[model samples]
Target chain A: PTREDLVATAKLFIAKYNEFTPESIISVRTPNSVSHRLFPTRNATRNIGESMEACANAKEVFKSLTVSVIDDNDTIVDERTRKVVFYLASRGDTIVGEWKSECIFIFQMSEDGKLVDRIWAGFDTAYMDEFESRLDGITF
Target chain B: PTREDLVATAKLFIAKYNEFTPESIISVRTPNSVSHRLFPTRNATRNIGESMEACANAKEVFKSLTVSVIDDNDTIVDERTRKVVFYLASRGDTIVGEWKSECIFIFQMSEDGKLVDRIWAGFDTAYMDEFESRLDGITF
Candidate 1:
């Protein structure tokens, strides 16, 4: 898939997941189950994991995810590790609105074995980066 | 069955359907059965006569969905239905987020009806919507 697919899939998945799991979570353990509510499976590669954490880490090297893009719901979106991560980033007369961080993303392989995907840095600093290991159990 | 259960069923059904028919679709009927792309299932119920053109007075709503939510390696991080939906409404700069829209949540009621006994609006939109439907399905 390409960057567009990632964006679209992220939109589709985010809408599908959040809408499908509106309520029922009391703690963080539910989404952790992988097989629990919506977050079922995750990638377990060190490179990929570090890549994500780096962007979510506010990196200066190569910001894999530092851009503003509109989401499918006609909203500015971001990745929140299967959760909505939003914080106001603007307040002005000309532009007085906030962006909704919809942590919806994916990775895709090109025609060969290279990874060519689009990433978004859309969450606010106030939004605690509570991204744990989305893939924590099971064996290969 | 409440909205939560239906949401869960929807997710499971998406994954299950994709798994079973990744190469193609299982059943897609809209107007009528053709050489391919048959008519969608007539989900309208408590109907009347054939003169009403119930089958043909149709415009497809939910299209054939593919692309489940997966990780870098496509390990299926939650199903497409699960991984989608949920917005972080930025109230201010505090990262305080609320579920923008009604989520497609999924949960199960116990055999003794213990789960169904509890409900709320702040977090019970999904389950409440499906409860009577499942009950009526078994009844009617």
Candidate 2:
């Protein structure tokens, strides 16, 4: 898919996130544990189930989050998966905006185009640096 | 390569990192901007040249850093590039004992098997969450 397709899917996922409650993280990620989330802290790894719990645990804080991405420039479609790793900035006018410092979203569509796998990031600073560098390497 | 090989390479990289001075960072990363170093704070994105400058600027603080990772577990070897993305922990019983809270390393082998491209991580929280989650998906 093109950048437009990526933007559409990302916005859809963000819509789900915008409506997120502690119990509703499943709306975005698979409960089968096919999905994953990581952070900067040691052993901060979480499976789908663990991720939802973390979301539930942070429900109040989760509600305060806002994310942004440069429409055309910040999207990278993985050549093999066709899934786009959308680079999000918190809010900004440049291709690389404010680091978001919160998280970025990853989505892979099912064969039927349903969102199946969701890899989310949280306040893990070290990880974001590596991620942005890779995205930067490929884009630039 | 086997797990042993991966572990050996990872340990070696960590050693170089341990001895790293601002001037010595070049010995670890690509001279080209193709390599990247990410960190937590905003404006923490650094290409090779930028990384060297950042390191020089932060040399006094850089010497006090440490990190860790499980052998065979945190290593993600890209099949296409034969490059290994090694995840390091902030505190460990092994090698570096303190988490830099700033970055991790990505090393690509040269055609002759020398370590060439090093994409480092910086203090971005959420990106690490996604990184570890993906590694867990593969390792498990």
Candidate 3:
């Protein structure tokens, strides 16, 4: 795919993610797509179903969520590898308080360039840990 | 810098990293360069001096450490942004055992394209945590 095409797909994925719905977010990914949260203490790849479930749980836990690009210059598109990297900042309102975090999302596009084949998410784990602790017994 | 120049710089950086000496690993970076370990529980940026200290400490903790590119195809060079991303696999022999980890290193080059201005390193935090646990009281 051309750089423009890959960037378009990435923009679509971000739009779906900002919709903050499990189905919407998963729509941009292939059926067998896997997502890895690289900054978590427990490293594991989540399949489509698991990814959807996690999104659903997150929605239930947070009263509101918002994610946006940090800067246009921060977005890197590699046509040769069919990969797009996005630097994003996120804010969420939980039971305890409002939390904010920053992350880097690497989207690997499928061969056809229409869907995401895999996702590698790297985030501020320290902030995430604090936020998770504030969740108390709540799980996402 | 052109794409080729950026790739050359990245390759040089990798070669220095493979040397596994604190001084050699830091030689390619600018004096004020900052490096961030994105996947660690602590999300702090280390300046050149701190980076050198960390490298020196890592050398002490591991009996042997080796880092190599996963594949040439995994190297992405964006000349427009003066950034290069490398997917790497590392093997480290520590007191407890041999440890293996995969990571992505994003190198932001200086305008002159001769030195790295910054680095963002994303690694498997779970594997790192496990390796740290095996260290017991040993600190790096």
Candidate 4:
């Protein structure tokens, strides 16, 4: 696929992610797609099914969640690598309070660039740990 | 600068960074270049001089430090935006012990792509915190 195609799919994935619905979030992923959270404290790889489950759980925990591109230049599409890197800021209303975080999302597209093959997510884990503690015993 | 020129500069900067010398690391940066560490616990921005000082100090604390591009595909050069994103893994022999971390570095280049204008660095902060604690009273 062309660079434009991959970038469009990446944008669509982000839109679906913001919608915060399991089905919407998984719609752009291939059956065998996997997501890896690259935080050292939570370095876990989840398959599509697991990712959908997590999205579902997160929807229940956060009143609203939106991840926005920090700048137009922050969204990079690499045609040779079939990857799109997005520098983003995430804001959410959780049970504890308002939560804000910065992150980088690397989306690896399928050969045809029509679906997401894999995702590598890196975020501010220090803030995430603190935010998790504020949830008391809640888990998402 | 052309895409090739920007990519060459980015690669040179990474080489100098691996050299682990204040002068070497700062050689490819503009005089007023700034670096922002996007970790929530250590979200600080530093100018070129401060960055040099930090590099010097880090050299004193670590026996060896090298950050390597994870894969050829992990380095994305965008001429339109004058930015390069590198997915990297850092390995160091610090005073405490061996340390390893994964990070994403977004290098915003100058107009001509001859030097780095700014840098946004995102790393595994939780692992960094743990690694620092192992250093006892030493600080970098």
**Best-performing candidate as measured by DockQ:** 4
Backbone clashes for every candidate come to: 37, 22, 0, 0
lDDT of 1 by residue, A10-57 (tens): 344333333223221111112212211112122132233443353333
Question: What is the DockQ ranking, best to worst?
Answer: 4, 3, 2, 1
- Runs off by more than 4 Å, candidate 2: A1-24, A28-87, A90-140, B1-12, B34-40, B45-53, B62-65, B81-83, B91-104, B107-113, B124-140
DockQ of each model vs. true complex: 0.01, 0.16, 0.35, 0.54
TM-score of chain A of each: 0.23, 0.58, 0.91, 0.92
lDDT of 3: 0.81
Candidate 1's C-alpha runs over 4 A off are A1-60, A63-65, A72-82, A85-140, B15-24, B28-140
User: Candidate 4 regions off by >4 Å?
Assistant: A1-5, A137-140, B1-4, B135-140
**Clashing residue pairs in candidate 3 (N, C-alpha, C atoms within 3 angstroms):** none
What's the CA error at residue A4 for candidate 4, in Å?
Answer: 4.8
Q: Show the lowest summed lDDT stretch of 10 residues, model 4 chain B.
A: B72-81
User: What TM-score does chain A of model 4 get?
Assistant: 0.92
| lDDT at position B48, candidate 1 | 20
User: By descending lDDT, how would the candidates be arranged?
Assistant: 4, 3, 2, 1
Sliding window of 10 residues with minimal summed lDDT for model 4 chain A: A72-81
Better of 1 and 3 by DockQ: 3
- Chain A, candidate 1, TM-score of 0.23
On residues B29-82, what C-alpha lDDT tens digit does candidate 1 reach at each position?
112211211001111221123312322231121123233433322222222222
